[PDB]
Design a binder for this molecule. Structure first.
Ligand code: NI
Length: 341
């Protein structure tokens, strides 16, 4: 049965709740972003409205094959009526097409659902700046003070440097980047740009990227592997046995791979900075971990919540154990006492 933190009070609306069958009373199913935990359940056979962003809509049509009529894309930053309830979609600064949703209830309550987000100060000068938010449904993925990680711009800097050094040292080396969902496209697009290349990838990955409304995308990507010296592979495949296997296929065209694994947090964030990173090495193949995050650090989350001063907070991540729930509430109480709301 659909959990209460996926339902919006005083509406027929649910959020990211596609895996339970029909939910009784639900006139509308909102989808925050195209990640499989959030969409798990959709198919071609859905005949209830789905409201989502334009970009999420393209992925729904082309990757899952939902029928154009049931996909209601909405533009961002635009006051929109949806069954006589005003709603707004806002950029979540997560993956392509990811949004947060502002719900304006008939009774006067205002609810923000963040979906998955990486909180940022530019959100403090959006339509949120204009009025009070009573209830916050919050992405709590990294709600604990151990979780620090660098800025996205810091990480992209490091990457543009590593890659370009190597390629200029050895002109027969390949850059590989790992992937398993949408998100983090900046890693590979930045590397390719510095190297004067398109990015090469499988047919299915190319299809997915062609749904994202990236400007100039035809100039940036290709399915011709031979012609490219930045390749994307499955994240499963980013290891030595798999990279050897792949290094064979290229047919004596490169004599060294240099790979990047964009990851979330790992325990090596506790004791090692970004300028002081190293790879594992089994012969000519070198694998970097780079902590490029599309979720809020603890500090970024904390600042966003203390600015918003919500009357109530409902976590949507790490809610499956009493210990995590209890740990999170304690942080929420500190934040509230510090900030005086
Ligand atoms: Ni996500």
């Amino acid at each position: 049965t659909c959990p209460f933190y996926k339902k919006i009070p005083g509406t027929g609306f649910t959020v990211d709740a596609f895996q339970y069958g029909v939910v009784e009373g639900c006139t509308a199913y909102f989808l925050t972003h195209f990640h499989s935990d959030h969409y798990a359940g959709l198919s071609k056979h859905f005949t209830f409205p789905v409201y989502c962003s334009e970009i999420t809509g393209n992925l729904l049509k082309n990757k899952l094959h939902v029928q154009e009529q049931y996909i209601h894309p909405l533009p961002l930053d635009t006051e929109c009526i949806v069954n006589g309830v005003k709603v707004v979609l806002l950029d979540a600064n997560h993956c392509p097409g990811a949004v947060m949703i502002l719900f304006y209830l008939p009774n006067g309550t205002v609810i923000l659902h963040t979906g998955d987000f990486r909180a940022d100060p530019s959100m403090e000068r959006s339509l949120l700046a204009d009025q009070k938010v009573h209830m916050l449904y919050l992405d709590t993925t990294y709600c604990s003070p151990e979780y620090t990680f660098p800025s996205q711009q810091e990480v992209i800097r490091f990457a543009i440097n590593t890659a370009f050094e190597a390629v200029t040292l050895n002109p027969h080396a390949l850059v590989v980047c790992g992937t398993y969902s949408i998100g983090k496209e900046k890693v590979f697009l930045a590397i390719a740009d510095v190297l004067g290349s398109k990015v090469g990838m499988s047919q299915e990955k190319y299809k997915t990227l062609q749904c994202l409304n990236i400007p100039e995308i035809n100039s940036l990507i290709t399915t011709d592997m031979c012609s490219s010296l930045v390749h994307l592979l499955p994240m499963m495949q980013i290891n030595f046995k798999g990279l050897q296997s792949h290094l064979k296929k290229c047919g004596g065209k490169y004599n060294q791979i240099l790979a990047f694994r964009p990851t979330g947090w790992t325990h090596s964030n506790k004791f090692t900075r970004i300028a002081d990173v190293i790879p594992q090495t089994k012969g000519n193949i070198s694998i970097y971990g780079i902590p490029y995050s599309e979720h809020s650090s603890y500090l970024e989350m904390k600042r966003f919540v203390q600015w918003l001063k919500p009357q109530k907070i409902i976590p949507t991540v790490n809610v499956g154990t009493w210990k995590s729930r209890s740990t999170m509430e304690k942080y929420f109480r500190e934040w509230k006492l510090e900030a005086g709301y």
